[PDB]
Design a binder for this molecule. Structure first.
Ligand SMILES: NC(=O)c1ccc[n+]([C@@H]2O[C@H](COP(=O)([O-])OP(=O)(O)OC[C@H]3O[C@@H](n4cnc5c(N)ncnc54)[C@H](OP(=O)(O)O)[C@@H]3O)[C@@H](O)[C@H]2O)c1
Ligand SMILES: Nc1nc(=O)c2nc(CNc3ccc(C(=O)N[C@@H](CCC(=O)O)C(=O)O)cc3)cnc2[nH]1
Ligand SMILES: [Mn+2]
Ligand SMILES: [Mn+2]
Ligand SMILES: [Mn+2]
Length: 159
């Protein structure tokens, strides 16, 4: 099973200048809980944005060019990325925009954080078709001293 996990600001913005400009510790904790002990697939730009391997996960990087770091696994196509995960119950696709576009048609589950924040961005989560997806979990949180915007955790499953 393939799942996508992402945090979206208003208008599906996910990034600007190869960064995420907000800081929401509760959402990063949600990301860690839902990805730990699973393989994570990311594109090369997202690898550069994170800047180091994510511990406790098999890190798989898509790039058309040879890898430059043997602490992670480098692959050259979507099918190779999936194969490199092996026989696991759930593969997590962690972006960015170009990678989400390619994996969305193959995904059964979306883990989305909707952040109440207006962000100028240059990268968006794919337009997906709402009729294709059922919301099976949602949890709203007001802003607090640690998290400066309200946010909603949602899990959707392909109908
Ligand atoms: N809010 C969130 O949830 C979230 C999550 C992830 C990322 N982001 C943000 O998203 C942005 C990065 O997204 P992006 O769309 O620019 O880039 P990306 O999807 O991270 O990376 C694209 C790169 O991945 C490689 N690639 C993708 N598909 C491939 C394929 N089928 N075969 C081989 N290589 C492939 C290519 O690398 P080569 O050029 O080396 O061939 C391509 O240039 C950043 O702003 C980041 O902060 C946000
Ligand atoms: N919901 C969501 N939020 C994100 O921030 C996110 N980020 C990415 C890609 N970028 C990043 C950037 C940093 C870390 C990171 O530092 N993660 C630590 C945080 C642990 C914690 O804060 O408790 C990790 O071990 O996962 C992960 C992904 C992909 N999907 C996402 N999905
Ligand atoms: Mn092929
Ligand atoms: Mn197999
Ligand atoms: Mn806000």
């Amino acid at each position: 099973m393939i799942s996508l996990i992402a945090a979206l600001a208003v208008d599906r913005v996910i990034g600007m200048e190869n960064a995420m400009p907000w800081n929401l510790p509760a959402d990063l904790a949600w990301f860690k809980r839902n990805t730990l002990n699973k393989p994570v697939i990311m594109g090369r730009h997202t690898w550069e944005s994170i800047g180091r391997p994510l511990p406790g996960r098999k890190n798989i990087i898509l790039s058309s060019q040879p890898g430059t770091d043997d602490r992670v696994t480098w692959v050259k196509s979507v099918d190779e990325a999936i194969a490199a995960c092996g026989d696991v119950p759930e593969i997590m696709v962690i972006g960015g925009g170009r990678v989400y576009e390619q994996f969305l048609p193959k995904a059964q589950k979306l883990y989305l954080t909707h952040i109440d924040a207006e962000v100028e961005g240059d990268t968006h989560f794919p337009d997906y078709e709402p009729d294709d997806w059922e919301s099976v979990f949602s949890e709203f949180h007001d802003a607090d001293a640690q998290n400066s915007h309200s946010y909603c955790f949602e899990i959707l499953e392909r109908r």
